[model samples]
Target: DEQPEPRTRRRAYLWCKEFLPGAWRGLREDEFHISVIRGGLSNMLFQCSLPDTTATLGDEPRKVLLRLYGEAMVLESVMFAILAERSLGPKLYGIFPQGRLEQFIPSRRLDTEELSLPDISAEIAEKMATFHGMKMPFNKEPKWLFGTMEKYLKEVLRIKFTEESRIKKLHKLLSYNLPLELENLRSLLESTPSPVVFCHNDCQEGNILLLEGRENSEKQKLMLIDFEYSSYNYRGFDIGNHFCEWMYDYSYEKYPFFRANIRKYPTKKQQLHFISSYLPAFQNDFENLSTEEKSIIKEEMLLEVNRFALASHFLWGLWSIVQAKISSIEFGYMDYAQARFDAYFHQKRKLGV
Candidate 1:
């Protein structure tokens, strides 16, 4: 029964009153409940619930995740509300300029280990297939990847690190020549073409939630959240970014605040199962298709995924550098940038890109 601090509680209650149904408008601040929910580094999440009787009598949502924006803000509401209607994400309960309230389902996010499990991995693949197939309301030119990176690169170049130790590390990081890295990564990806599709650019475990109870037999009991960076990009980038995410865990309690186990990247056998599961969602007659067709598509996608994996590394590494200079989050952004950039180079050399 613990509640948020008085000011937050009161302000949240007021917003709920204004945006929620009439049932909430009549209720007092003490009658509502507010509790903090662990959230992404750049946002604050709170669970706001109504008293049982009040919720039961209303048509409004019983509980919601109130998300207050931080450093990163984008107009994600267009596809966000659309995904809710399509059951690909949480329902949108309320929205405002500064923040919004989302359906607070009783669910838990998958741990780093669970992400690689056979059953859960297949489920994620299937979900991602449906995710990519979605036709959102935006230009579908597949420019979001380089477009975003170009912006992040500019921010990274201008950063003036004040810390003496950081100044040295920053110089070392910059020695890699981030501008050329971006140019080379883009050139490599462009050489090997991948289809333009709506991509969940950040597919890490923290952005995924597992629902508590079964409600739909056809759909996977999983929900993908956070669409700030979601847009029309290479399908391979979406799948490849997910594979890149396989190696990192951002929930650590200690300094650096994340773990990257390079060896944990999905195996060939594991990648096959995920790709096989995903292919069906894109095809109407997946079962009747010849093994020959399936094999080629899977093989092609494997290369596609690996090639685009470089882009994910480039995308997040530059992003981390910018966050290191500006973000107020506790995580070690510089350390994270170093890890991502190191992996980018290693992965590039392995692929001979």
Candidate 2:
């Protein structure tokens, strides 16, 4: 019999028991089992099950997620997860410093077949509304939002381009373009008086989970998971990131249906419905903000969107180059990025900017 050894299973079970002593204390070794739910480059998630007891009745078998960070992201993953849990995100069970072990939310990945554009857009809007509503208790320090992006960009340059000449080349490329975008974001940040709040810096489809109610109830709830890159940032950053995600799909193709689906524009009846659904969560007074300041924020937001679109193009291009160097050679990403660049630039030119 070539089945996985009982000893191997025992080791994993014991490890979980050690980290979550109270949760698994009375369970016999035979009562516990591990299921590998998903595997990816960054992490491997396993569902841990134990027999239900009177004390743990409401608690379904806990899903334990383990993340093994790669070369570029070990520190950021640990730090940000801690911060998000402390702020407005999920409850933190325990952190295994040796091997990243965190409690997982029992969820199903959003199926592309079942999802329509409108459904996803509405969910995205509501999530952002909820995120914006929370207030951060920490001091107003520009620690993790725009500043973090600048720091990450510097790190990428340092790691990828070691030679002074190569670093200079990348610097020239970034300096010529990225600074303008950053400036636009800076202006917007200055104009909005709302205190900075925690944001899920990466809020794409893969990270979001559709939680089903027990007994297959009609009411399904959406929970945003994977706070690996979450941090305190401008509220607009949360909205912008999600909007960008909606604009592009998994393959990074631009989805034309997003605009209508998200209800950015609508007829009189539709507009009322959209506003009624969105405004309660989004409405906030720009405290002590002048009319001019308000205009600048709106303008800068549009400018920042264009800037992000451009940055996304650059990032995809860089990824393609790196992939080619690594022998992964994803030409499709290269072509897709180029098309996006062209599209955004065309829009810019049309606006006579």
Candidate 3:
């Protein structure tokens, strides 16, 4: 029998005992508890905890967020560790080859609808400002946008859908000529003047955690998670990806497992609210700047974001196609790819790009 190491409570408990010696010194294996966490499509998540005991006294065992790497995964551990150290992300407990343990910040992920709320949107804006301002050690060439899309496109092109239903969707996906779409988007975005910054490339609602009963500032109440796609990239691309996310609701009850409502994209006035909140953090002595100076920046930033949103659609459209071929998750990746590519054309027409 294959005694899988990563999913076993006994192994995890043993891991806790070995790694967190001080905290789990007197704990028994039977005392450990592991509860499966939902809504994690990319990775297996578990709430690992131990019962409180007097033997440990002041050094009580702390709960952990155990995350096992997905089959399609990367160097998220390194980036997350740094973010944890800086208080920009959850605290890191133990790092291993299969997965890592994080501080269990009893939190709930914000849904798609919450992405457009006035207060939440503004707080997210501030968070984006701080996140983009960060200086990362990765190469600053802004290649991640086109580079990743190119990689995914290659993977997408290699797949052959034999199932009649899958082939039907593949036919629709192929009609868009994704290769051409990618090139056209790259050319247009390359000519744009968006700045390159350290970005939380996947800043969707599900990635933003709302702390439970935590006492902190309004902005601190929300923390960003998941850095799998985090990298140095165009600022506008980051913002555009977030705006695109406003339309997608990931929690689901059926096969597709996600919902997309284009009508839910933030309105112009609402966009301004977020832009204004974000600008101050991006600028130096912004409070002392003239009203017109601020207004001009907001206008340009808005245009930059809307234009780069085209790239967001195209990039993720390719990503969906690749996931359609490779991912084990039961979501409708082909349908998602179709929607995103269609949106790419729709936005291109809307922006007259």
Error of 3 at 230 (Å): 0.6
Stretches of model 3 off by over 4 angstroms after superposition: 1-7, 38-42, 55-61, 71-75, 215-217
Question: Considering TM-score, where higher is better, how would the candidates rank from best to worst?
Answer: 1, 3, 2
In candidate 2, how many Å is residue 190 off?
A: 7.8
- Taken over the whole model, the C-alpha lDDT of each candidate is 0.83, 0.50, 0.80
Error of 3 at 278 (Å): 0.9
Q: How many Å off is the CA of 152 in candidate 1?
A: 2.0
Give the per-residue lDDT of model 3 (tens digit) for 220-289: 6798888887888899988888999988887877868888777777788988998888888887688788
lDDT of 3: 0.80
Q: Which has the better lDDT: candidate 1, or candidate 3?
A: 1
TM-score winner, 2 or 3: 3
Report the number of clashing residue pairs per model. 0, 0, 0
Candidate 2 lDDT over residue span 143-165, tens digit each: 65556546644444444645565
lDDT of 1 by residue, 111-176 (tens): 888888887888888888888888787879987788989999998889898899778878999898
**Each candidate's TM vs. the true structure?**
0.92, 0.61, 0.92
Segments of candidate 2 deviating more than 4 angstroms:
1-11, 21-23, 28-30, 51-90, 100-104, 111-116, 137-195, 214-220, 251-278, 284-340, 346-352
- Tell me the lDDT of candidate 2: 0.50
Clashing pairs in 3: none
